[PDB]
Design a protein around this nucleic acid. Structure first.
Ligand SMILES: Cc1cn([C@@H]2C[C@@H](O)[C@H](COP(=O)(O)OP(=O)(O)OP(=O)(O)O)O2)c(=O)[nH]c1=O
Ligand SMILES: OC[C@H]1O[C@@](CO)(O[C@H]2O[C@H](CO)[C@@H](O)[C@H](O)[C@H]2O)[C@@H](O)[C@@H]1O
Ligand SMILES: [Ca+2]
Ligand SMILES: [N+]
Lengths: 554, 412
DNA sequence: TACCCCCCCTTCGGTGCTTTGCACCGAAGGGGGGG
């Protein structure tokens, strides 16, 4: 045979042999287009005949190339991949057009039979053994071994990406001012050279790739904008995603909403204000992917206004390293947030959203902090720097939060923007007891077996209450005891509890909770003007805690 | 052209497979420039994806360094080479290092590039350099010499190090020298002027053996512990005594002599929190005896070299931070408090990073170990900013906790 | 009835402290997207 470029040594997991599984009963309609190109591979040295000396076998099928009449060859290596050594992928992420700098001339080109242009390792070729079917079951079919990277192997992508870089390294060093975005076999080549000199250096690279046996077909070659790259439409000074089609189904299943959710998450990168909360509330706890489920009036409203955003076309701009990065966040309600990253006002680089519900109890300040951290990581990935933040939270509101919180928290260089709705703290626990306010000694208890319990309080003025509770836990009675003292007290109240569980939840100042009992406590805390929470150990003969501990245990 | 010491992982253990986290532009530019010159000098060489192992890498600037310094997160690799740098080529720890009036740290990491590395172990030193906006896939490398930040590196170089130090250890007999990874700790009871002079002598003593030094000044004798203190009030409210009894109840897990029976008697009623409560005779005496027990050292606390060190940190607000170092719960080996550090009153993450660095430095001087930290911070908040403020050549183990302050035990 | 990478949204099951209830997180399956 002939050796084109430098190979990569491959092994198996130690103490294991090759794949020995039988083929699929493939239909003869695909066998016609299969043996066609398969026989053409031997002439080019891509595939070779093997004798019965090779005791391996793996299934083979084929699917059509999307938006094309040509067919793609796939080989099922699932059993081979389970026994093949592990790699470390050199693909760390996906390039985004918002990180592209403006270039005077741009060229995009695809690599014909990419995987099939890289030689496999010599000693490993035997394990790619597979048989080819026929029109009838009489003829056996030639068995082959791969001389190149096959489509369907778990090691083909990583070896191709690394080998492509070693070929492009000499050219990148000879042409330092040329930007080459390498992603699998698609290459984005841009420069500030004149369009005349640009296409000369392009042909210099096409010859450089051809020097190592890499084809650059003209049909895949793109010389004029708008360039179709990574599912985007790259214009000389703007970019946008390729058009997005939303399903027009009258009756929606689970797979329909899932397709709709993913389409909206993809659109949220440039189309501002996409929300998927109410559409995602339909896919919770569902069993069958084919199950039909009706649309709520909330999700019906959400899908309507989301379609109006996709109605008018939007676009993004390119990155200017000389100007600062600005990120502005807006609150959308129900734990939903959106943001726009821009350098010039009203000219967005990209958009996005953060709507993850982290924890059982939280507030708007925590979720804004989590959104800033999501934007920071996203911005460092795309541009390598942290943007300047414009946050809908008062400077003194944030100061009060992070200084009083028991956990360390921080937000980078930011300024306040007066765009409602503003993020605020809905109540503030007093640091010292309140003079003249009634002091409620609360406690609760529940039986592990009976699930019944009591919750009550005793005050310094003689006030008292005990309430029987059904199908409750020890923690719920302690929260319930706090709910009672908030209900039966004035605008200012001192509360003494022994529950570490309840005190830890309330001191973090949440404004939302999965527990409906906690939401009612929050509702009461907002109504109050001064609340003081204190903790004491139980069974120590302390204050009214000993007296109320006796009441809730009888 | 030097013999390579063979290195093997712990029995039944695979190499490190840790993902590379995104890097800023200034750190990627610095790493590309550093890795380029390290390749033309043969210290590293590019590899491919057939290596299934990987270790994170980023860049730092030491305190007032202004020059970038490469740093690899070998924490995962060191846990898988623990058999090497502890049992085999371990280093005894000088108990007198913490007693010197001044200790200086020097970065001797550049000398490890002289000794080659075992060929069978270079497959575990793999690291990947990312690209901005994923313009280029990962460029992977491997170390051909002793890597900076690997715990097996100072153990191999120890034989070469003690020969370079032997002339100066004889010219100055009573000066203590300790080596922890890429750092060299040298302490003396000499005056500040004499101490800094002998450092330069050690710098020139290392220059003629082929090593540069791109110095931190410590004072271990100045370090003070933080004890549990009770307030001084001319009048006590119900809430004051309630917080006090709860604090003494929690403190009873450390000092068993704490009693609360005479302070709980003052709370037997159902009184308002702001109501003033006069102290009885037995309560004043029970409080007086409790203040004395907190003056005593904890009974039966001593360091165990076979146990790991645990470090807890509490944010006290207004720039104050408290910490405790222990091996067993409630058997603290040291307690302390930091204040007015960099980033105070403006940046919580910078203060915590500075606190972790100061605590780890103290643990290396006193015991020669790095503790595992329980950080009062969320995972996503810490993993986003901690690299922007890290100024040390080592990285300790850490986990994240969320313990609300039900009782302010360590600071008033 | 193929492989590899990134993203969000949900479930579920393991973990440890708030404790045998409750809260958290990481793996996993659903989808979108890239080659
Ligand atoms: C879409 C797809 C891509 N690849 C990778 C990307 C490329 O490395 C190579 C196939 O690439 P090619 O066939 O060269 O790409 P192409 O489809 O544009 O075809 P061609 O230029 O001949 O007209 O495998 C798969 O293995 N499975 C897939 O489902
Ligand atoms: O492999 C983890 C190794 O590094 C640390 C801490 O940075 O853990 C890191 O890598 C882990 C990968 O699972 C994650 O915890 C995160 O990347 C990061 O914490 C060490 O604590 C650990 O030994
Ligand atoms: Ca192609
Ligand atoms: N109780």
């Amino acid at each position: 045979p002939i050796s084109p470029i430098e190979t990569v040594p491959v092994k198996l997991k130690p103490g294991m042999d090759g794949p020995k599984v039988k083929q699929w009963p493939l239909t003869e309609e695909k066998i016609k287009a299969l043996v066609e190109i398969c026989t053409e591979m031997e002439k080019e040295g891509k595939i070779s005949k093997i004798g019965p000396e090779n005791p391996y076998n793996t299934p083979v099928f084929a699917i059509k190339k999307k938006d094309s009449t040509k067919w793609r060859k796939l080989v099922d290596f699932r059993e081979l991949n389970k026994r093949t050594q592990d790699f470390w992928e050199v693909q760390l992420g996906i390039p985004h057009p918002a990180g592209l700098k403006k270039k005077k001339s741009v060229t995009v080109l695809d690599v014909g039979d990419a995987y099939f242009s890289v030689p496999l390792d010599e000693d490993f070729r035997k394990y790619t053994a597979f048989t080819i079917p026929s029109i009838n079951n009489e003829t056996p079919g030639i068995r082959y071994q791969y001389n190149v990277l096959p489509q369907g192997w778990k090691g083909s992508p990583a070896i191709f990406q690394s080998s492509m870089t070693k070929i492009l390294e000499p050219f990148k060093k000879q042409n330092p001012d040329i930007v080459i975005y390498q992603y699998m076999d698609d290459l984005y080549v841009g420069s500030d050279l004149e369009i005349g000199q640009h296409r000369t250096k392009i042909e210099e690279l096409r010859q450089h790739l051809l020097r190592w046996g890499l084809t650059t077909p003209d049909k895949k070659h793109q010389k004029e904008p708008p360039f179709l790259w990574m599912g985007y439409e790259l214009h000389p000074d703007k970019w946008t995603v390729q058009p997005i089609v939303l399903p027009e189904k009258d009756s929606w299943t689970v797979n329909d909403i899932q397709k709709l959710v993913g389409k909206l998450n993809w659109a949220s990168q440039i189309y501002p204000g996409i929300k998927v909360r109410q559409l995602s509330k339909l896919l919770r706890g569902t069993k069958a992917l084919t199950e039909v489920i009706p649309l709520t009036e909330e999700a019906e409203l959400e899908l309507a206004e989301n379609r109006e955003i996709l109605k008018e076309p939007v676009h993004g701009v390119y990155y200017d390293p000389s100007k600062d990065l600005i990120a502005e966040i807006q609150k959308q309600g129900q734990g939903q947030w959106t943001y726009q990253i821009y350098q010039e006002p009203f000219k967005n680089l990209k958009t996005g959203k953060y709507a993850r519900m982290r924890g059982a109890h939280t507030n708007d300040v925590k979720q804004l902090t989590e959104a800033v951290q999501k934007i920071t990581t996203e911005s460092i990935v795309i541009w390598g720097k942290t943007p300047k933040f414009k946050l809908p939270i008062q400077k003194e509101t944030w100061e009060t939060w992070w200084t009083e919180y028991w956990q360390a928290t921080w937000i980078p260089e930011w300024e306040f923007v007066n765009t409602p709705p503003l993020v605020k703290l809905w109540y503030q626990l007093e640091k010292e007891p309140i003079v003249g306010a009634e002091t409620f000694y609360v406690d609760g208890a529940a039986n592990r077996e009976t699930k019944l319990g009591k919750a009550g309080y005793v005050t310094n003025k003689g006030r008292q209450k005990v309430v029987p509770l059904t199908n409750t836990t020890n923690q719920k009675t302690e929260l319930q005891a706090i709910y009672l003292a908030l209900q039966d007290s004035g605008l200012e109240v001192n509360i003494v509890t022994n529950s570490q569980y309840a005190l830890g939840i309330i001191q973090a100042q949440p404004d939302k909770s999965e527990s409906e009992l906690v939401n009612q406590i929050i509702e009461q805390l907002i109504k109050k003007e001064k609340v003081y929470l204190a903790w004491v150990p139980a069974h120590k003969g302390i204050g009214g805690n000993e007296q109320v501990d006796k009441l809730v245990s009888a | 052209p030097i013999e390579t010491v063979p290195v093997k992982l712990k029995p039944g253990m695979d190499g490190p497979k840790v993902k590379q986290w995104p890097l800023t532009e200034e750190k990627i530019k610095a790493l590309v420039e550093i890795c380029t010159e390290m390749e033309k000098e043969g210290k590293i060489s590019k590899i491919g994806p057939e290596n299934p192992y990987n270790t994170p890498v980023f860049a730092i600037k030491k305190k007032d360094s202004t020059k970038w310094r490469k740093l690899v997160d070998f924490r995962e690799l060191n846990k898988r080479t623990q058999d090497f740098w502890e049992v085999q080529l371990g280093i005894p720890h000088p108990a007198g290092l913490k007693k010197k009036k001044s200790v200086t740290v020097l970065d001797v990491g550049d000398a490890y590039f002289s000794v080659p590395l075992d060929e069978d172990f270079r497959k575990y030193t793999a690291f990947t350099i990312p690209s901005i906006n994923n313009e280029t896939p990962g460029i992977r490398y491997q170390y051909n010499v002793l890597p900076q930040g690997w715990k097996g590196s100072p153990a191999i170089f120890q034989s070469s190090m003690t020969k370079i130090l032997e002339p100066f250890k004889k010219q100055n007999p009573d000066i203590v020298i300790y080596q922890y990874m890429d750092d060299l700790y040298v302490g003396s009871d000499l005056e500040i002027g004499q101490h800094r002079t002998k450092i330069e002598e050690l710098r020139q003593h290392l220059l003629r053996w082929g090593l540069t030094t791109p110095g931190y000044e410590l004072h271990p004798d100045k370090w003070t512990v933080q004890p549990i203190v009770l307030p001084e009030k001319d009048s006590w409210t119900v809430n004051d005594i309630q917080k006090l009894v709860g604090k003494l109840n929690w403190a009873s897990q450390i000092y068993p002599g704490i009693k609360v029976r005479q302070l709980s008697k003052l709370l037997r009623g159902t009184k308002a929190l702001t109501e003033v409560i006069p102290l009885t005779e037995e309560a004043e005496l029970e409080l007086a005896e409790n203040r004395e027990i907190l003056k005593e050292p904890v009974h039966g606390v001593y360091y165990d070299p076979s146990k790991d060190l645990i470090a807890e940190i509490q944010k006290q607000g207004q720039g104050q931070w408290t910490y405790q170092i222990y091996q067993e719960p409630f058997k603290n080996l040291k307690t302390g408090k930091y204040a007015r550090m960099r980033g105070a009153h403006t940046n919580d993450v910078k203060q915590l990073t500075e606190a972790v660095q100061k605590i780890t430095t103290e643990s290396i001087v006193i015991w020669g170990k790095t503790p595992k930290f329980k950080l009062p911070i969320q995972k996503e908040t810490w993993e986003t900013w901690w690299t922007e403020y890290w100024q040390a050549t080592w990285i300790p183990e850490w986990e994240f906790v969320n313990t609300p302050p039900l009782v302010k035990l360590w600071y008033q």
